[PDB]
Amino acid sequence: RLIYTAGGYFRQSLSYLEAYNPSDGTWLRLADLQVPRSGLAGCVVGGLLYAVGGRNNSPDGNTDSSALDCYNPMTNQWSPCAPMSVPRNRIGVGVIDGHIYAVGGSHGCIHHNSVERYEPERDEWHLVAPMLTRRIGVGVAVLNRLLYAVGGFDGTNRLNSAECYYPERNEWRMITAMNTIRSGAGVCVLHNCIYAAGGYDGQDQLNSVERYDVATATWTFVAPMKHRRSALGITVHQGRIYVLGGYDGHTFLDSVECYDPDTDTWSEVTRMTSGRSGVGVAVTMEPSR
Fold first, then answer.
1. Where in the chain are the domains?
2. Which of 233, 252, 253, 251 has the alpha carbon at shortest distance from 243?
3. Within 13 A of 40's CA, how many CA atoms are on the CB side?
4. Is the Cα dihedral 114, 101, 242, 193 positive or negative?
5. For a disulfide at 66, which of 37, 87, 162, 270, Cβ 3.0-4.6 Å?
6. SS (H, E, C) 148-176
7. Where are the S-cGMP-cysteine modifications?
8. CA torsion, points 6, 34, 107, 284, in degrees to nearest 10?
């Protein structure tokens, strides 16, 4: 398995699909996205890598994207899927029962609280209950088949609140808020906790990391990252968290940091081939040859 980073932003949106091998340290250059996109999210269902939402920021135009695209590491090929009902820049996504939930994001000046669900067997999207809050730059994680939306920006205020979606009741309920306001944080699940790393509170990019324990319904800080960063990519690979790129108020970072929960330590493991923010990141099998 490899860590795939798709799209991103550096002076314009990007079409890179690159895969990192934590063992031998290589970055593999794979098939470009059909359309350059930043602020997208990545996920894996089956073994297929999906790139969801985002925005094409190009010298010739600036369009938010509703697109859903699917990458097969067996063929090194992208294929389009049916699009979401609306464009969603700075989206969050999560996977439950082989279905992709697309959460929040923006379209122009519209800040979504809508959520919709993709069924790959039918190549079909369907709207579900909207969140209690409009959230762009929202982090999303799935724990115990429940979907969590964490932080973000409602168009006026950045958020430390978090809410939880129950699919069997089709409803959202607020949970304990994070200690820190974060939009554009990296949010993932590791072991049995939700981690929220970095982000932007409207004043500073953050290096703090905190984790939600569902059993105690409390957020606790862990060791901070070495580099403050907002709009970072994040994923889990072999029991460790990897954060990729992001923006620190001055630079689009290429730093990749890795969190070992056994030692509560972050270390810098690699650099991306070029700094960028707003990537989509996920883990799946190595490509053919």
1. 1-289
2. 233
3. 39
4. positive
5. 87
6. EEECCECCCCECCCEEEEECCCCEEEEEC
7. 109
8. -30
